[PDB]
């Protein structure tokens, strides 16, 4: 995750790997709070 | 913590380990007692 | 407690302004179906007009809430 050592971010990415902005990881994390994955957690 | 290798682990890292693990455990444990002390058996808190 | 998720002793012991049920884990979900099966049937000229008592409780509800300004 890049935010306010990103200089090599472009390079690591040059290998088919993805780095993320903070708005992206936040969206990702927030997606674990969606009702769907919440109930999943409640099962195991 | 940066620039701290095995032999450098000291006061900072031990404290850091406390914030980043032991007290997180303590925190989950705390809300467990609260809920339980209130019979709250059907409203889990999700821990990311 | 085990079928509707509230304590009648509590309600009696300290008159609660409001009260929310939470349909938590596997037991939370067991509870809410008992809420979801509340039917009010109405035989009107041969026809049986049945409705859910708890309109809102459904497969996606996470809780219901009883309300009263007094208690």
Distance CA B26, CA B18 (A): 10
Tell the burial category of A22 from Cβ atoms under 10 Å away from its Cβ (0-12, 13-18, 19+).
exposed
**Which chain B residue lies closest to A31 (C-alpha atoms)?**
B48
**Which chain A residue lies closest to C28 (C-alpha atoms)?**
A42
- The 3-state secondary structure of chain A reads CECCCCCCHHHHHCCCCCCCEHHHHHHHHHHHHCHHHHHHHHHC
Single out the residue of C11, C3, C2 nearest to residue C66, CA to CA.
C11
Check A33 against B46: CB less than 8 A apart.
yes
Distance CA A41, CA B22 (A): 23
Give contacts of B46 with chain A, Cβ < 8 Å.
32-33, 38, 41
CB distance B42 to C29 below 8 Å: no
CB distance C4 to C31 below 8 Å: yes
Distance CA A30, CA C47 (A): 48
CB distance C56 to C1 below 8 Å: no
Tell the burial category of C35 from Cβ atoms under 10 Å away from its Cβ (0-12, 13-18, 19+).
buried
* Least Cα separation, residue B13 to chain A (angstroms): 22
- Tell me, in Å, the resolution of the deposited structure: 3.1
Tell the burial category of C21 from Cβ atoms under 10 Å away from its Cβ (0-12, 13-18, 19+).
buried
Tokens of C71: 């208690």
What CATH class has C17-70? Answer: special
């Amino acid at each position: 995750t890049r935010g306010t050592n990103n200089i090599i971010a472009e390079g690591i990415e040059k290998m088919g790997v993805r780095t993320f902005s903070q708005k992206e990881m936040a969206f990702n994390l927030l997606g674990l709070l969606t009702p769907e994955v919440v109930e999943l957690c409640q099962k195991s | 913590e940066q620039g701290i290798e095995l032999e450098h682990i000291d006061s900072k890292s031990e404290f850091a380990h406390r914030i980043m693990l032991t007290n997180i455990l303590r925190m989950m444990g705390c809300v467990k007692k609260q809920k339980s002390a209130r019979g709250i058996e059907t409203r889990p808190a999700q821990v990311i | 407690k085990d079928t509707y998720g509230f304590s009648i002793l509590d309600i009696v012991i300290n008159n609660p302004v409001n009260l929310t049920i939470h349909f938590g884990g596997e037991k939370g979900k067991r509870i809410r179906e008992n809420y979801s099966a509340m039917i009010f049937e109405t035989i009107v000229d041969g026809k049986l007009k049945t409705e859910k008592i708890f309109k809102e409780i459904n497969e996606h509800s996470t809780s219901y809430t009883f309300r009263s300004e007094k208690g």
